[PDB]
Design a protein around this ligand. Structure first.
Ligand SMILES: Nc1ncnc2c1ncn2[C@@H]1O[C@H](COP(=O)(O)OP(=O)(O)OP(=O)(O)O)[C@@H](O)[C@H]1O
Lengths: 356, 150, 356
């Protein structure tokens, strides 16, 4: 049963990352994992409002940029728009009910809130560079490239929604309704999490970071400034996100917190590896959709693809998964600019002695 | 549409791809060399009727500017981009003409001394053509290359 | 079924406040109810970090303030601590799954986030004025006055959690598990909301605003400055909250959005009225717990009680409910300071004519 306040006085210090008596009180006097606490502070200090950076000069830019290019930028923006639109709610219904410790809780709501800003920003951009917002929005919902990954990751959430729901609404083993038997197994839920979160490490680590090299591409071309300025901040606030997605994964796999999960990490090792490597491919294709009409003075299908390998190759070396994509040197180094801390004695004495 | 002026003289539409492939030919067998890097480095400014030669020229200097200690290969990268331009700017085509044929052509142009056409018969020339390894041009480090161009 | 992204292209413009296809995309190009959008902006601009205002001078204050007074302040702070601690998560699991329009959605997450700050602040205060945080925290969870209302309102949330859950996990009419038949009725859920939210209008309108006159009481005494400074900001960000709780109630009762609810408003008119008037009393008692040992140079049980009547009397005149508490003039006007915009010709000509 889920309680917005748990009655019991339970020492948070020991409550596992997830699956623990729902946090009774919002305190901050201490933590079990200092990480989360810090992620909140650094994020809070990173606060910013999309309306701050000016978008005027950007308007004329889109009007000028070639067709094969105009497509590249309006298309990749639609992709980002969706990612956070969902991510915004997602962390809040999917994880909250499972949150068991205070530090982690506050972070979640903050993590989610941070996304709402990115969502608002993308909107502030469209109105400036396009004539009609709707036409661009109604497409982000009904489009052939868009929907294809859209349902992919978004599924893991809807799953942990029903799964975790029956764990409270109902007990364990078998309950039958209308001739249908649905099993709730504690362990059957601890996996519906470890897998659903490894889907975020990727959407907030590789899926998004890849969608940035595209926006920052126009930046090195002196085009669509406003977007680059805003996008930069996005990546920064994002850094904190994937950073936590790992600390949440690593500690859940170590067992130092959740003993049971320690095993689930092995019987899912191959499972997670699949999603990572597999999902990564989805991106490589997206490039074709942009470089279909034509290449860009900054990069084309060829280049952008190499990136996914370079990033995913390391991105996974952190979580602990196996490395599949070939090793490489960042094809683009110019991108780093945007993820760094975004705004005469003479004597006969000594001579007399030498013997030439 | 977009235009371009091939060194040949004729016109063409811009082919963003054709550039990339060129850089590739260079990045071939190299590391720490970003094909995308050189492009953005060069701030190549496009404008109608731009000569293809000039376009190619831009990347050469750009690649040469990315020759840092951390990027030792870039020295060779740009070198390959350079050797290309030269050979084509003197032969019309990427592959130089036979030892004999060339020696003679340049003779009547006042550039090579006929002194050779007399001390060596066609046979001996076409024979020496064997020793010639044009491919050795791809063993130059741009430092040396630039000097050769003068 | 709950979907973190709905597949369908559905014109938000028409989606009801709640019970509507889950918001597909986070857009802001338009809204059905401009109110929500504004509440977000004004809130975003109200952003602030509790660490900003200094708490040094406050430390010595608590050490000095008499015992009958020390109790008053540490006790009323525990009450606030809990209210937001829960409110923080509450809006996010209880309402989100029901959110049907974009503007409202973004507001919810923001509304919730805003509370997290208040939670963090209360912590920043305790460490300053007390020697040990835990001792004060572990009490906010296990205490006789605290728990008594704690479970009261916190219940409405836990209810809309299970209720709304079966509406997705399961259909309607009767489903029987383990010899138990549980009914899910659409209308049976539209009430579990209208009543659960009228519980917030009160916790964020009368329950909290009453807990402020206590903190601002020491302010007019030149005591516990830091707290007053922080508390002020709290009330401001709060103003936006109850403001929305009404717009959400009024439009849900009008039927201009949800036709069905229009009826539910009448068959719950008396129902809601009960909770309002009833809950209000809970506060009057709380005073005794503070003024038990002794009164305060600023106010005592007598005064503080009068307030609840003056505030609740009007607070309800807005939502549309009937007025039960007797009419009155604010007993305390000094409180307003903290809710306002917180940081010679002479002639014989004219004479000749007079006829004395
Ligand atoms: N249509 C084009 N648009 C842009 N750049 C081009 C185009 N064609 C060639 N280039 C580039 O300019 C450079 C010059 O190529 P090259 O030395 O072979 O002479 P060319 O006159 O361009 O002949 P060709 O293009 O048929 O190979 C190459 O680096 C090539 O990438």
């Amino acid at each position: 049963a889920y309680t917005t306040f748990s009655q019991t006085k339970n020492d948070q210090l020991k409550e596992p990352m997830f699956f623990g008596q729902p946090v009774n009180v919002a305190r901050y006097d201490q933590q079990k994992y200092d990480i989360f606490e810090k992620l909140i502070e650094k994020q809070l200090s990173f606060f910013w409002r999309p309306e701050e950076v000016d978008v005027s000069r950007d308007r004329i830019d889109y009007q000028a940029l070639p067709e094969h290019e105009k497509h590249i930028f309006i298309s990749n923006l639609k992709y980002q728009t969706l990612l956070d639109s969902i991510q915004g709610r997602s962390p809040n219904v999917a994880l909250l009910p499972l949150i068991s410790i205070p530090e982690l809780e506050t972070w979640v709501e903050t993590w989610a809130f941070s996304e709402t800003i990115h969502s608002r920003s993308y909107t502030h951009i469209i109105r400036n560079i396009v004539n009609d917002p709707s036409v661009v929005f109604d497409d982000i919902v009904t489009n052939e490239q868009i929907q294809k990954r859209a349902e992919g990751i978004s599924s893991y959430y809807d799953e942990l929604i029903e799964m975790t729901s029956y764990w409270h609404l109902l007990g364990e083993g078998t309950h039958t309704v209308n001739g249908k038997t649905v099993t709730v197994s504690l362990r059957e839920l601890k996996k519906k999490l470890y897998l659903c979160l490894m889907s975020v490490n990727a959407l907030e680590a590789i899926r998004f970071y890849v969608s940035f090299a595209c926006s920052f591409a126009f930046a090195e071309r002196e085009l669509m400034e406003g977007n680059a300025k805003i996008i930069r901040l996005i990546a920064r606030d994002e850094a904190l996100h994937l950073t936590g997605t790992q600390h949440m994964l690593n500690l859940l796999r170590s067992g130092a917190d959740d003993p049971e999960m320690a095993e689930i990490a092995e019987e899912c090792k191959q499972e997670c590896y699949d999603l990572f490597v597999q999902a990564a491919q989805q991106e490589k294709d997206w490039a074709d959709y942009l470089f279909r009409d034509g290449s860009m003075i900054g990069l084309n299908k060829d280049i952008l693809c190499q990136y996914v390998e370079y990033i995913t190759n390391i991105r996974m070396q952190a979580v602990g998964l196996d490395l599949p994509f070939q090793t490489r040197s960042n094809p683009i180094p110019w991108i780093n600019t945007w993820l760094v801390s975004d705004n005469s004695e003479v004597d006969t004495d000594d001579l007399s002695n030498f013997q030439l | 549409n977009l235009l371009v002026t091939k060194r040949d003289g004729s016109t063409e539409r811009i082919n963003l791809d054709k550039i990339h492939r060129v850089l590739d030919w260079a990045a071939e067998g190299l590391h720490n060399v970003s094909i995308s890097q050189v492009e953005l480095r060069s701030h190549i400014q496009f404008y109608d009727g731009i000569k293809t030669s000039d376009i190619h020229e831009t990347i050469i200097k750009a690649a040469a500017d990315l020759i840092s200690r951390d990027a030792p290969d870039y020295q060779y990268l740009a070198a390959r981009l350079a050797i290309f331009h030269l050979r084509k700017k003197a032969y019309g085509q990427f592959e130089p003409p036979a030892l004999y044929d060339h020696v003679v052509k340049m003779v009547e142009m006042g550039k090579y001394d006929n002194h050779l056409l007399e001390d060596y018969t066609e046979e001996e020339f076409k024979q020496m053509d064997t020793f010639i390894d044009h491919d050795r041009d791809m063993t130059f480090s741009y430092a040396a290359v630039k000097q050769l161009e003068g």
